[PDB]
Design an enzyme around this catalytic site. Structure first.
Site, short mmCIF file in Angstrom:
data_model
loop_
_atom_site.label_atom_id
_atom_site.label_comp_id
_atom_site.label_asym_id
_atom_site.label_seq_id
_atom_site.Cartn_x
_atom_site.Cartn_y
_atom_site.Cartn_z
CG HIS A 278 2.52 5.20 5.32
ND1 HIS A 278 1.27 5.56 5.78
CD2 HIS A 278 2.46 4.79 4.07
CE1 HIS A 278 0.76 5.15 4.90
NE2 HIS A 278 1.24 4.71 3.69
CE1 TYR B 244 3.76 1.66 5.51
CE2 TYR B 244 5.44 0.05 6.05
CZ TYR B 244 4.83 1.13 6.38
OH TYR B 244 4.53 1.57 7.57
CG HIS C 167 -1.38 7.31 7.34
ND1 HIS C 167 -1.25 6.07 7.80
CD2 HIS C 167 -2.54 7.71 7.65
CE1 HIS C 167 -2.54 5.72 8.33
NE2 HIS C 167 -3.22 6.71 8.24
CE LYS D 198 -2.74 5.84 12.76
NZ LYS D 198 -2.37 4.57 13.11
CB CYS E 150 2.54 8.42 10.13
SG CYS E 150 2.79 7.52 8.77
ZN LIG Z 1 1.63 5.94 8.19
#
Ligand SMILES: [Zn+2]
Length: 146
Positions: free
Chosen positions: A13, A42, A118, A124, A126
């Protein structure tokens, strides 16, 4: 609160911050707890000078990819957007260098784990770059897929 059963994946990420935002776990832990979670989601944060800081315990369930927190490591790069708020692969040479040894170390110690971005699994942008092309060719390009 508990430890994961397995580790099927290592997710990468970005924190969706701008260049000038020289932040690390002290700030992102604070931001995540103001949103109602118990801690940083995380397991590892890589600051823009290449320092890797630990977040959640390496063996714990974190909150970073939903429906996957049960069986994975989440790694976060500080950066990801420009000044317009658009996704941008603006990570530093030093961040990418630290990322590549952390991941070789992680893939080695979590027998059978797969490396994932991700954006492969959720709608997304990301981490804001194409993971396969950087892992393979060491080329960093801005991307919502890969
Ligand atoms: Zn992410």
């Amino acid at each position: 609160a508990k430890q994961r059963e397995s580790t099927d994946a290592i997710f990468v990420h970005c924190s969706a911050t701008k260049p000038s935002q020289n932040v690390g776990v002290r700030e992102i832990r604070q931001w995540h707890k103001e949103q109602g979670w118990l801690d940083v989601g995380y397991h590892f944060i890589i600051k823009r000078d290449g320092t890797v800081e630990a977040g959640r315990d390496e063996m714990a369930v974190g909150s970073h990819a939903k429906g996957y927190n049960h069986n994975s490591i989440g790694v976060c790069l500080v950066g990801g957007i420009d000044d317009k708020g658009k996704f941008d692969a603006n990570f530093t040479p030093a961040q990418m260098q630290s990322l590549r040894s952390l991941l070789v170390t992680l893939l080695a110690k979590y027998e059978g784990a797969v490396l994932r971005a991700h954006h492969e699994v959720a709608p997304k942008a990301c981490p804001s770059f194409d993971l396969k092309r950087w892992w393979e060719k060491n080329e960093l390009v801005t991307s919502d897929r890969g």
